[PDB]
């Protein structure tokens, strides 16, 4: 019930990383979020590349869903369970941003071809995004943020130590909108160096 315990792995979080790297990342974003699309599509691989894929960083998504679409496709991802399967989802539906049907808004082609793509049978998307456990999961989740974090525009990032035991302002930690990724780097390098320092 804390904005501290909030920050850190939960256990119905999906993972991206190893659980047991230095530094965490949280990162709550609307899958249907324009500014987050282009971050996930220009910034976001090579920082997977360069801490993610190299063990320096847990990273942990959190859906934030705004509308309809983003809403069912946040219930969509819930159909992957492998932890780059679930991520690839994400990271498909943030780079056909440009594919929904922006005047029939309850119009779900878009989660339909991504279904296909990835050999997704239809009883299987037909349940997921249309479980309403994962749906109560995903809003209760959100509301919980705004509630405990603050959290109004997305995306947010949260970037600290991934370390339980520790005790830190979640504002001290918090980053908000578009970051280029000239930002991160500074940013993760320098909590690296000192996750490295203290960890001996």
């Known amino acids: 019930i804390t904005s501290n315990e909030l920050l850190l792995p939960l256990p119905n979080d999906k993972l991206l990383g190893d659980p047991k790297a230095p530094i965490l990342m949280i990162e709550y974003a609307s899958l249907t979020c324009y500014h987050c699309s282009l971050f996930h599509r220009n910034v976001f691989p090579k920082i997977k590349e360069k801490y993610i894929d190299t063990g320096k960083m847990l990273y942990i998504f959190r859906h934030f869903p705004l509308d309809y679409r983003g809403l069912k496709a946040a219930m969509l991802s819930h159909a992957y369970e492998k932890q780059e399967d679930y991520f690839n989802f994400n990271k498909a539906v943030f780079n056909s941003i440009d594919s929904w049907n922006y005047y029939n808004?309850?119009?779900?082609?878009?989660?339909?071809?991504i279904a296909a793509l990835?050999?997704?049978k239809q009883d299987a998307?037909?349940?997921a995004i249309n479980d309403k456990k994962i749906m109560d999961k995903?809003?209760?989740?959100?509301?919980?943020?705004?509630?405990k974090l603050g959290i109004?525009?997305?995306?947010?990032?949260?970037?600290?130590?991934?370390?339980?035991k520790s005790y830190i302002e979640h504002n001290k930690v918090k980053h908000g909108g578009y970051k280029e990724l000239k930002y991160f780097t500074n940013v993760i390098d320098k909590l690296y160096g000192k996750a490295i320092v203290k960890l001996e």
């Open 138 to 147: 995903i809003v209760n989740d959100k509301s919980l943020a705004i509630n």
């Open 105 to 113: 808004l309850s119009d779900l082609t878009l989660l339909q071809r």
């Open 118 to 120: 990835s050999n997704l």
């Open 125 to 127: 998307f037909n349940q």
């Open 152 to 164: 109004t525009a997305t995306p947010i990032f949260f970037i600290k130590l991934n370390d339980d």
